[PDB]
C-alpha cells in the first residue's frame, strides 16, 4: 500500500 | 518582444512538467491541493498562498504574467509550499525536488 497527501491506494505489485 | 518569447518558453516548460515523462512525480502538483483529504486539514493554516500547475497554466492563458520571472515565482511558490508544509522525510518532498530540478534546468536556459 501507498499513501501520499491523503491519497491511499494499493499498488499493482501488492 | 523578448518578454513575449520568454513567456512562450514558459508554456513549453510547463507543458513538459505536465508530460507523461514526469507524471510519476509531478501528479501531486497538477491540481490545487485537496484540503478535504485525510491529514490535510491544517494545510490552509500553514500555507497562506496555495499554488499548483493548473493555476499557473490558467494565468499563462489569461496572460496575467508580465515577464518570465513572475512565472518562475509562482512555480517556486508551488514547491516552497510543499517544502514548508510537508516533513522533509516525506515522499512528496522528494517528488518536489525531482520536478523542481526539471524546472530549474529548463528555466535556466531561457532565451536572453
Ligand atoms: N497487489
Residue numbers in the entry:
A (entry chain B): 1 to 14
B (entry chain A): 348 to 459
Paper text:
In contrast to our observations for peptide 3.1C, where selectivity between BD1- and BD2-type domains appears to derive from contacts in a region distal to the AcK pocket, the 3.1B peptide recognizes the BD2 domain in a very different manner. The peptide and BD form a 1:1 complex in which it is AcK5 that is bound in the pocket (cf. AcK12 in interactions with BD1 domains). In this case, the interaction surface area is much smaller than observed for the BRD4-BD1 structure, consistent with the substantially lower KD. Furthermore, CSPs observed upon addition of 3.1B to 15N-labeled BRD2-BD2 are consistent with this binding mode, indicating that this peptide binds to all BD2 domains in the same manner. This difference again highlights the ability of RaPID-selected peptides to robustly distinguish BD1- from BD2-type domains.
